Structure 1
Amino acid sequence: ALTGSYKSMFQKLPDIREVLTCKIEELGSELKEHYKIEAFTPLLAPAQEPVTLLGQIGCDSNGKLNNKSVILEGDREHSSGAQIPVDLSELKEYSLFPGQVVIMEGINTTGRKLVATKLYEGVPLPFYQPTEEDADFEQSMVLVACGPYTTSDSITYDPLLDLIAVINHDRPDVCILFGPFLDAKHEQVENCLLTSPFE
């Protein structure tokens, strides 16, 4: 998880495509092996009988996702990355968002529009297996706070001083401090009124 700083801010469309399809295919293999799914089918194949279909959900247009403005985009090795609208009228219970990998067992008798009939709740990863040393740890308290640490119209950082005071008083084991530490959306910096460099 990024011991070093970084490499680039240069993107390549084919490589982003490879990342996306790799994510889809990995989630698909995991779900298929867990659910013992027989076999996936291409999105554009017109199949009369209900056929399981794999792919990531997406919004048809550029706006907020609507319950009847949803398409399924498949993987390359099964559907060649094709897209197909999905109809949720028949589906009973669901919870979707753009870019989530799903296996939908809807019926698609025309090949141009799928109608959902059941959604497969995705399976979480296995937990972290502890060891004897892990159980050998006494109770420890953890602090967690998230910025910004100054009010919308201040630089005195009084909230940070109060947080430091409580940290000193409680003497917690580990303290997690999230950013931002000088918010980019702060009106003070958004208007570049500061007399010192950001760094």
Structure 2
Amino acid sequence: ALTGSYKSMFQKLPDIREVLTCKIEELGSELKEHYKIEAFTPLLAPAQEPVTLLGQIGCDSNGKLNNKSVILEGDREHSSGAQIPVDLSELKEYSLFPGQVVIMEGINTTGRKLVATKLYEGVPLPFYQPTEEDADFEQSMVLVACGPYTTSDSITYDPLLDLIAVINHDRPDVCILFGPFLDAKHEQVENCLLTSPFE
């Protein structure tokens, strides 16, 4: 999971594209192996029979996604990125969010609107297969906490300390601590009144 600072801080649209597509293809590729569907249909090709599209939701404007405005943007490999809005009136149970890689089955006759009939349920990954060694370990207790680690009106880090103490008292095996240590949002920090360098 990455160790150094980075590789950069400059992106080539020609690649973000490549990504978002794989995103959908991959999952798809596997969702297709699970529910064993036979073939996705182009989001642009019309037909009278029910079809199984492949795509990613997305809103049609800059606002809050909604039951009306949903849209599916297919993958490159099949629908060379065509966008076709979605009709849900006819769908019972659904959970949608922008970017949600989804497999839908409905009817798109004109090829300019798909009336969803079914929204396949997402499929997760298998869980980790414990080696025999991992069953030979004894009980551990992990603490876990995340900042801000100070009150929004002081730089005392009081809570920080309390934490510490608590860490001690209970003597945890692991203490995973979540930033922000120095809150980019802490009032004093954003108006740069601190007399010390961030670093």
The count of aligned residue pairs is 199
Q: Distance in 2 between matches of 1:193 and 1:16?
A: 39
Q: Sequence identity, in percent?
A: 100
SS of structure 2 residue aligned to 1:93: coil
Q: Give 5+ residue unaligned stretches, structure 1.
A: none
Which secondary structure does the structure 2 equivalent of 1:145 belong to? strand
Partners of 1:22 and 1:140 in 2: CA distance? 39
5+ residue gaps, structure 2, are: none
In 2, Cα distance between equivalents of 1:67 and 1:189: 41
Q: Provide the C-alpha distance between the structure 1 equivalents of 2:189 and 2:3, rounded to a whole number of angstroms.
A: 29
User: Aligned to 1:116, what secondary structure does the other structure show?
Assistant: strand
Deviations 1:3-41 (A, max 9, x none): 111011101111100011011100100100011001011
Q: Deviations over 1:46-70 (max 9, x none)?
A: 0111010000000010101111101
Taking only aligned residues, the RMSD between alpha carbons, in angstroms, comes to: 0.6
- Measured in 2, the distance between the counterparts of 1:125 and 1:132 equals 21
Is 2:16 aligned against 1:16?
yes
Shift in Å, 1:92? 0.6
Cα distance in structure 2, aligned partners of 1:25 and 1:119: 17
The residue number in structure 2 matching 1:36 is 36
- Cα displacement string for residues 158-196 of structure 1 (whole angstroms, at most 9, x for unaligned residues): 000000000000000000000000100110111111000
Deviation of 1:157 after TM superposition, in Å, equals 0.5
Match of 1:111 in 2: 111
For residues 47 and 58 of structure 1, the distance between their equivalents in structure 2, rounded to whole angstroms, comes to 23
Distance 1:64 1:159 in 2: 36
CA distance in 2 between partners of 1:41 and 1:21 (Å):
16
Residue 2 of structure 1: how far off its partner (Å): 0.7
Q: CA deviation at 1:132?
A: 1.0
Q: Could you state the TM-score of these two structures normalised by the residue count of structure 1?
A: 0.99
| CA-CA distance at 1:103 after TM superposition | 0.4
Partners of 1:160 and 1:37 lie apart in 2 by 53
**TM-score, normalised relative to structure 2:** 0.99
Displacement of 1:122 in angstroms is 1.1
Asked if 1:154 is matched to 2:154, the reply is yes
* Moved beyond 2 Å, runs of 4+: none
